[PDB]
């Protein structure tokens, strides 16, 4: 929270149904990518891999868990089914 230009929202971001990640065409002219696993560890201040602009994207932490069921990706650790 030292250097920031703008703030983006998860709701106003695209979804990448391939490896559980989000995308957002950075104003610089590139595509700002962000993985759900990375952001899970408190990652809001991401650095663009083109212009290196500091942005603070906010997340609700809702779709982060729901998307896991929507996407057909193979997450780490075994899955035990018990009820
Ligand atoms: Zn950029």
Curated annotation (Swiss-Prot):
Record function comment: Required for the first step of diphthamide biosynthesis, a post-translational modification of histidine which occurs in elongation factor 2. DPH1 and DPH2 transfer a 3-amino-3-carboxypropyl (ACP) group from S-adenosyl-L-methionine (SAM) to a histidine residue, the reaction is assisted by a reduction system comprising KTI11/DPH3 and a NADH-dependent reductase, predominantly CBR1. Acts as an electron donor to reduce the Fe-S cluster in DPH1-DPH2 keeping the [4Fe-4S] clusters in the active and reduced state.
Annotated protein name in UniProt: Diphthamide biosynthesis protein 3
Subunit structure: Component of the 2-(3-amino-3-carboxypropyl)histidine synthase complex composed of DPH1, DPH2, KTI11/DPH3 and a NADH-dependent reductase, predominantly CBR1. Interacts with DPH1. Interacts with DPH2. Interacts with CBR1. Interacts with elongation factor 2. Interacts with ATS1/KTI13; the interaction is direct. Interacts with the 40S ribosomal protein RPS7A. Interacts with the 40S ribosomal protein RPS19A. Interacts with the elongator complex subunit IKI3/ELP1. Interacts with the elongator complex subunit ELP2. Interacts with the elongator complex subunit ELP3.
Disruption phenotype: Sensitive to caffeine, paromycin, and thermal stress. Resistance to diphtheria toxin, sordarin and zymocin.
All residue ranges annotated as the DPH-type MB domain in the record: 4-60
InterPro entries noted in UniProt: DPH3/4-like, DPH_MB_dom, DPH_MB_sf
UniProt-annotated stretches for the region Required for interaction with the elongator complex: 67-83
SUPFAM superfamilies reported for this sequence: CSL zinc finger
Gene that specifies this protein: KTI11
Species this protein is from: Saccharomyces cerevisiae (strain ATCC 204508 / S288c) (Baker's yeast)
Pfam families: Zn_ribbon_CSL
Signal peptide: none
GO BP term (any one): tRNA wobble uridine modification
Pathway membership: Protein modification; peptidyl-diphthamide biosynthesis
Predominant place of localization: cytoplasm
